[PDB]
Design a protein around this ligand. Structure first.
Ligand code: HEM
Ligand code: HEM
Ligand SMILES: CCCCCCCCO[C@@H]1O[C@H](CO)[C@@H](O)[C@H](O)[C@H]1O
Ligand SMILES: CCCCCCCCO[C@@H]1O[C@H](CO)[C@@H](O)[C@H](O)[C@H]1O
Ligand SMILES: CCCCCCCCO[C@@H]1O[C@H](CO)[C@@H](O)[C@H](O)[C@H]1O
Ligand SMILES: COC(=O)[C@@H](C)c1ccc(-c2ccccc2)c(F)c1
Ligand SMILES: COC(=O)[C@@H](C)c1ccc(-c2ccccc2)c(F)c1
Ligand SMILES: CC(=O)N[C@@H]1[C@@H](O)[C@H](O)[C@@H](CO)O[C@H]1O
Ligand SMILES: CC(=O)N[C@@H]1[C@@H](O)[C@H](O)[C@@H](CO)O[C@H]1O
Ligand SMILES: CC(=O)N[C@@H]1[C@@H](O)[C@H](O)[C@@H](CO)O[C@H]1O
Ligand SMILES: CC(=O)N[C@@H]1[C@@H](O)[C@H](O)[C@@H](CO)O[C@H]1O
Ligand SMILES: CC(=O)N[C@@H]1[C@@H](O)[C@H](O)[C@@H](CO)O[C@H]1O
Ligand SMILES: CC(=O)N[C@@H]1[C@@H](O)[C@H](O)[C@@H](CO)O[C@H]1O
Ligand SMILES: CC(=O)N[C@@H]1[C@@H](O)[C@H](O)[C@@H](CO)O[C@H]1O
Ligand SMILES: CC(=O)N[C@@H]1[C@@H](O)[C@H](O)[C@@H](CO)O[C@H]1O
Ligand SMILES: CC(=O)N[C@@H]1[C@@H](O)[C@H](O)[C@@H](CO)O[C@H]1O
Ligand SMILES: CC(=O)N[C@@H]1[C@@H](O)[C@H](O)[C@@H](CO)O[C@H]1O
Lengths: 551, 551
């Protein structure tokens, strides 16, 4: 039996097959030695004995508001934001390592940007069980597992107050770097760029971007409807959009991401950002009359990328974490650190980010209450209400809690089933192996995992062993922190991917983070002072209630 | 007139247009402040005044063998090597900045790997002169300029003793990252990868790599001739190769780099390396009897990348530099530094690397003295003599001095004329500007550039102003260090590009630089101990005289 199936190497040691039956762990720079990289160096031992529980730190960050107020107003804020940025980042390998084709480092894996990368290699195709060594010869039926533990019975709003304005932002934002290729198969992506390159706005390819661009003042094409600015029609922007058969070109909206027409919430942001881009082009042209269309367009793109990162860290993530510590976006915090300004999206981060529980039972807009059937392929709800209105509505409707289980609307539950099935195609390692890879102790039992005893008993029966529990179900069924939107694992595993993804962008490098990169002090401040409110209200007639938090 | 034409911004400050006539320098992190970034900070000032000239350091590095030997045996060697690696590297922007289309940072320039990057923005198109503000409205005829100061009259051997073996290595080695696309035009490359990825061995695209691979024991396809191993024919490896019309397929060899069939010298190295790949495969298989073709192929490739970088730094550059300090390839030297493990090829680096003066008047193989018309497309010379034979030949024949002028054989002189013509197309800034960008004061007169009077006087009449002298012309006409192969500019401008490209390779990052990456201690040692002599001799029937220095 393949020795590596036992996942013998600890602390990121790499398992290597030798001869016909031997194995050997490369423990280079892991802080440990020994056949399995478990004998700690004095310093490694000091660090792990002094480190407080991921649950205890959470406590410190969610208590003593008075304390954090003085802290947030002093340089201590910075010191902490950096501490967070680096410790969280060092958990993500850079350059990237493995992919669906290679469970080992290779030039193909490093250069071939069409692949999704992965943090932990796969379960060797020749292991006793699908998960390696533990569990039954067969995993629970994905559909059954979903229906029994992920299907929503009664809507459970997010205790942290997260609304749908946040939910859709999350969907919009992530579908710029999560674009699995149906033609190539799981493990493959079209979102080359692997990060916040705003490809869901400008397109994952040049010819497409060229088709979306107006080529005047560096602006994006658009149309007027009811006196408001909206994306252009596919007739005007000859770009492929995924719409139900029968909808003519003149009735489709072109935006950058082919799937965005399938949701008013999505096209909402599509519209907001489009307006923002063209607005920045104006401010720019004013400052640089000698500039052509290209430099205006390119410069505006950089500024928007900046706004995006700015808002994701200081508002998006702030809402998610619920920390009293005010997160800060300032690339300079890493200028004294050893940091690689690059990033590659991981399949695990893709799985982890399936936050479908956020979606409501139905979408309420004013006195109206739309169902999924009326909301999904709606070709006019956006224009009927206009930007402001939909923003006020989504900002007021609570989103569902992500963790704790049984909170995915049946209308979209199929996604979860597919997420599970794919997981097995990708052969993602067990949840406990990932708990460890991200600095956490593995769960010793399902009751430990689920703060309760009922689902724990059933899960125990289905899987047989806690060590057989799969990645996604684990994230979604883990017991949640007090009044949190999810559990610690979603935080301890998600944080490193996110922050690496935000700071691992070239505009955050010393070489790029210059005023001149954004066309001057003017463009640099738009990035530095970006706000969800400003993003909406500076592109709308009236300013509605806009926030990632419900009033 | 456009203010940026005056290259007003010093010390890497960025010139930016404001209004219809104003400008502004972005001095961020330049060590200077003030309108043109001329006001030195306290530490900046010390460094620049207490820094010995390049000329003086070169003196220290080529005298006192006795002291250097004692140094090479101490930790000081690592200290100096590291200094050399970091100081030299910091001169290269990473992430990359501009390209043939954007004289400013942009997401297209950062993402579009099909472009060559550039270190100085082009000469603004609306400037008074072709070079900006100095010189005549019309630059010297490229053909005349070439015939007057670059055409060889009497072969001038390189005093440092460099031979053709070194000459062909350089060509072979560089042609893996210098692959300008004729279809796309100047400023564009086909060598994505932008570095030492060995695309000249495995191809620069996957489908091509596949046709070249045997898919057995991770090996490359090959054919037998006279009991010796040679690259396959285009009939067995249906891969594009540039050969004159009329040459049957059975006579065309397939090598990954479409242009190597054009020189026994190139095809020789293609053979040597191809033989080394399969050799490394046999070694890996012995250690990992359970591996398959893909992993064997990938691991071998990484090992060869490592070997190439080892040989380039410790032998190739050692020979070039002429330094008594013993250069050293060891990634650990940078583990405590802030350094990006990425690299993008610059057009200036391409221009600078046109070392055609290395080629002789003819090619001496034993008693026979083959001419250019007998050598150029000979498809049967390599096989006629075999590897040992040609390696011995090229190792014994001196290559010509790269600097000094009048030393390029008429047979290939058209190449220099075209480099000059392309420079103007790329609108490369003036030589003195590049001198400054690389820490050197500009030459104040042609007589100061060339250590003589005659050529100087004529260049003065042609260019009219030292500030109009172009990039390539300057590098080749600059006076040479004592008995060196070329001038300081070639070293001071080429060292940063080179080392950044070698060390800025993913295998040199803490993440990849582990024994497991190379198949274990066996693979790693093949890298840690690679030699030009072992590369050849461990793959030939008999070991000839092999070296980069003539006997
Ligand atoms: C109107 C509510 C939503 C619907 C109808 C929906 C639908 C879908 C569908 C059909 C897929 C692809 C399924 C497949 O290929 O089998 C998908 C993927 C995904 N969804 Fe949603 N989704 C919704 C909301 C969300 C939200 C709020 C998020 C959280 C940011 C989200 C994140 C994702 C992710 C990360 C993927 C995988 C992307 C990829 O691999 O390309 N979805 N969703
Ligand atoms: C055997 C004698 C040589 C011949 C016949 C030769 C021929 C050529 C030709 C025809 C081109 C393309 C010219 C064009 O497109 O106008 C070229 C480009 C080049 N050669 Fe050579 N060359 C020789 C030796 C060398 C050597 C010794 C070096 C030194 C490394 C060298 C470096 C280059 C470089 C850097 C380029 C440009 C790369 C690119 O843009 O793709 N060549 N050479
Ligand atoms: C108030 C102090 C805040 C310090 C912020 C540090 C950033 C959090 O860092 C995280 O802490 C976890 C808990 O031990 C670890 O398990 C994770 O590996 C680590 O990345
Ligand atoms: C105690 C040592 C004092 C050294 C005085 C050095 C002064 C350099 O002075 C600088 O020279 C530049 C170029 O000429 C100017 O452009 C700057 O404005 C000027 O401040
Ligand atoms: C004897 C000690 C030698 C140390 C080698 C240092 C590496 C050379 O470094 C170079 O020196 C030049 C001359 O000042 C500078 O102009 C260059 O910017 C710098 O990179
Ligand atoms: C960095 O550590 C942290 O606790 C905070 C700042 C943090 C950072 C990022 C996330 C996060 C997790 C999953 C998806 C998106 C963002 C998160 F939930 C918390
Ligand atoms: C780093 O500074 C140095 O003087 C040494 C080590 C050095 C390093 C690299 C080069 C070099 C220059 C042009 C093309 C290839 C190599 C060179 F000519 C000298
Ligand atoms: C290769 C190897 O050493 N694996 C063994 C495993 O087979 C055994 O059941 C276990 C008992 O704790 O210890 C370990
Ligand atoms: C020193 C040490 O811990 N050795 C263990 C061994 O006992 C165990 O059976 C094997 C499989 O996990 O991994 C290793
Ligand atoms: C992969 C990619 O987008 N490459 C583009 C190419 O298509 C385009 O023609 C060229 C000129 O802008 O720039 C580059
Ligand atoms: C130099 C180059 O290749 N640029 C191409 C251009 O020729 C083409 O018309 C355009 C449309 O996709 O894309 C880009
Ligand atoms: C199911 C459907 O597509 N039709 C609805 C329509 O009944 C509703 O009045 C309108 C308001 O935006 O949105 C659309
Ligand atoms: C815009 C500007 O200030 N440029 C001036 C240029 O017009 C003048 O001829 C030169 C004299 O040295 O100095 C500089
Ligand atoms: C203090 C200083 O450096 N000022 C100069 C100015 O005199 C010159 O005309 C201009 C353009 O070269 O650049 C700046
Ligand atoms: C640009 C490139 O080479 N990408 C390749 C793609 O062509 C191939 O189909 C896929 C599957 O191995 O891997 C990747
Ligand atoms: C999944 C995918 O796209 N991989 C492709 C493969 O189908 C094709 O046969 C091969 C030849 O180029 O290149 C790669
Ligand atoms: C035109 C041509 O290339 N012919 C030469 C031939 O004269 C020479 O004897 C042989 C051995 O190297 O190589 C070939």
């Amino acid at each position: 039996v393949n020795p590596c199936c036992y996942y013998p190497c600890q602390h990121q040691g790499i398992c290597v097959r030798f001869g016909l039956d031997r194995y050997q762990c490369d423990c280079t720079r892991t802080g440990y030695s020994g056949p399995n990289c478990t004998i700690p160096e004095i310093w490694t031992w000091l660090r792990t004995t002094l480190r407080p529980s991921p649950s205890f730190i959470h406590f410190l960050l969610t208590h003593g508001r008075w304390l954090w107020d003085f802290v947030n107003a002093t340089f201590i804020r910075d010191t902490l934001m950096r501490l967070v940025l680096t410790v969280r980042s060092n958990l993500i390998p850079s350059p990237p390592t493995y992919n669906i084709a290679h469970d080992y480092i290779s030039w193909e894996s490093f250069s071939n940007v069409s692949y999704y990368t992965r943090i932990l290699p796969s379960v060797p195709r020749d292991c006793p069980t699908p998960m390696g060594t533990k569990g039954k010869k067969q995993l629970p039926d994905a559909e059954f597992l979903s229906r029994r533990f992920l299907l929503r019975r009664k809507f459970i709003p997010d205790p942290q107050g997260t609304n749908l304005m946040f939910a859709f932002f999350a969907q919009h934002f992530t579908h710029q770097f999560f674009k699995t290729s149906g033609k190539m198969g799981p493990g493959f992506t079209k979102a080359l760029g692997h990060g916040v390159d705003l490809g869901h706005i400008y397109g994952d390819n040049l010819e497409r971007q060229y088709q979306l661009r107006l080529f005047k003042d560096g602006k994006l094409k658009y149309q007027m409807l009811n006196g408001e600015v909206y994306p252009p029609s596919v007739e005007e922007a000859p770009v492929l959009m995924h719409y139900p058969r029968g909808i003519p070109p003149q009735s489709q909206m072109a935006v950058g991401q082919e799937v965005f027409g399938l949701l008013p919430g999505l096209m909402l942001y599509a519209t907001i950002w489009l307006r923002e881009h063209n607005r920045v082009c104006d401010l720019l042209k004013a400052e640089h009359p000698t500039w052509g269309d290209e430099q205006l367009f390119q410069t505006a793109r950089l500024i928007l990328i900046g706004e995006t990162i700015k808002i994701v860290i200081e508002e998006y993530v702030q809402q998610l974490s619920g920390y009293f510590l005010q997160l800060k976006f300032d690339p300079e915090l890493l200028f004294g650190a050893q940091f690689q300004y690059r990033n590659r999206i991981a399949m695990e981060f893709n799985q982890l980010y399936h936050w479908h529980p956020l979606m409501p039972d139905s979408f309420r807009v004013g006195p109206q209450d739309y169902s999924y059937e009326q909301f999904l392929f709606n070709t006019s709800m956006l224009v009927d209400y206009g930007v402001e209105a939909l923003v006020d509505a989504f900002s007021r409707q609570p989103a569902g809690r992500i963790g704790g289980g049984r909170n995915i609307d049946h209308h979209i539950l199929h996604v979860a089933v597919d997420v599970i099935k794919e997981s097995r195609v990708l052969r993602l390692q067990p949840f406990n192996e990932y708990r460890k890879r991200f600095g956490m102790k593995p769960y010793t039992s399902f009751q430990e995992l689920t703060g309760e005893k009922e689902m724990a008993a059933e899960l125990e029966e289905l899987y047989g062993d806690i060590d057989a529990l799969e990645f996604y179900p684990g994230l979604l069924l883990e017991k949640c922190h007090p009044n949190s939107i999810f559990g610690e694992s979603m935080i301890e595993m998600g944080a490193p991917f996110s922050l690496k993804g935000l700071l691992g962008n070239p505009i955050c490098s010393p070489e790029y983070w210059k005023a001149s990169t954004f066309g001057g002090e003017v463009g640099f401040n738009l990035v530095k002072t970006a706000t969800l409110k400003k993003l909406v209200c500076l592109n709308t007639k009236t300013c509605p209630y806009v926030s990632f938090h419900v009033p």
